[PDB]
Symmetry: D2
Subunit: 120 residues, 4 copies
């Protein structure tokens, strides 16, 4: 159910393939921030989730460098896939920028993204 | 500078290879939690960082399933590599457990790990 | 715009008075977790928000001890108040439980609550 | 115990009084960021912690407005007091800036501060 094209609340696009042994591969395009076009992502998911109603744990990373720009930053999303009539991925994320040691206290933004397969 | 074995403040071991393109691949072994032996990790790093002494941004994911057990959870670490005599990878992490929707509010732990070349 | 009763997505109830001195005072009642009845909250808010269309930054703390139980934990919420017809307080939170040092790595849950004037 | 003057790893100063009612009151002065001089804080702590070696849960809030400056932001620290020979407070924090709706995704920084009573 994870394999597909997903969109978050900002209008960003998450194109992912879930491999049979836990791999996530694909591309991410952010609607916001110091970013343009598509970026490589990789991650992991639980390929044998519980069967008791629980979601499927997963996470992935984007380093914000591509052929067009380099933000010197990386985001990781940690969350779960929730199956149902409308499948959803609920995440929290951490966006770390490369900083000097003096500025490291303000290196990391935190937020939450929810994704569905509905195109905006 | 990223490639190799790193140790965190909990006694865990991060073994990673940084590819020329920005790929991170390797294994993670946690000293704590619902974990035994090594787990696959994958992630990404900035392969063309600033040259002013700023850190190199990176992140990786472990899904806590291996040949030996499955915790039904995943951790992501987001942080930066700082090189030099006292090299370090400083991270914050999010550990999400599969939950029912009613329990989703308590799905996610947050913390911070510092990794060094010597334990 | 802040003083009064607010409800989050879990069904919890936030009762607050925003004082001229920047103070937040009131009670919190959680629909979930190791909690029953009302708990004291205190916090702070920006009493002179930006002259533009920006939210009002605020935060508050509950220690989860009242006359009935003690969960040996505390939650802080950090966020912003957005006024208008569909007024909202959008927050992220950190729930820290008292733990031994060996277990400190798993002391802190993170999440996000959205509060509205009408119960969802 | 908690009452006293604490310094964090950045050199910031946390002057706090822990009341018998579970209240924290005092002032905070940051070594970094969009801040000058002292700011009011308020928070809560577990006034009847466990006796099994666990820490004491606590949290507090600063809104970054005083007589001199307004950053239109608020930080909450959530953590625990660890009562060794050398007492320490270990926290994680959320710093939310007031933003427009379109920029709300980048409203919140996350980090971790550790404090002791040792004057740097
Ligand atoms: O500005 C940067 O440093 C790079 C782009 C960051 C975009 C972030 S990642 C978290 C959030 N979710 C999105 O889809 N976009 C923003
Ligand atoms: O308990 C689980 O669900 C799986 C093991 C989690 C171990 C966590 S990941 C973040 C922190 N850093 C570590 O080295 N181990 C813990
Ligand atoms: O279980 C505990 O330790 C005390 C109750 C915690 C309830 C949390 S606070 C964050 C979230 N928002 C709520 O309204 N309830 C939960
Ligand atoms: O820049 C601002 O918006 C106001 C000042 C914020 C200072 C932060 S709060 C968390 C961290 N710990 C500190 O002692 N200072 C910084």
């Amino acid at each position: 159910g994870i394999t597909g094209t997903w969109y978050n609340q900002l209008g960003s696009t998450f194109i992912v393939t879930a491999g049979a042994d836990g791999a996530l591969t694909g591309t991410y395009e952010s609607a916001v921030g110091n970013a343009e076009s598509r970026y490589v992502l990789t991650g992991r998911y639980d390929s044998a989730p519980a069967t008791d109603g629980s979601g499927t744990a997963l996470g992935w990373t984007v380093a914000w460098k591509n052929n067009y720009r380099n933000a010197h930053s990386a985001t990781t999303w940690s969350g779960q896939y929730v199956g149902g009539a409308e499948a959803r991925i609920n995440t929290q994320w951490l966006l770390t920028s490369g900083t000097t040691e003096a500025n490291a206290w303000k290196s990391t933004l935190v937020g939450h993204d929810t994704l569905t397969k509905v195109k905006p």
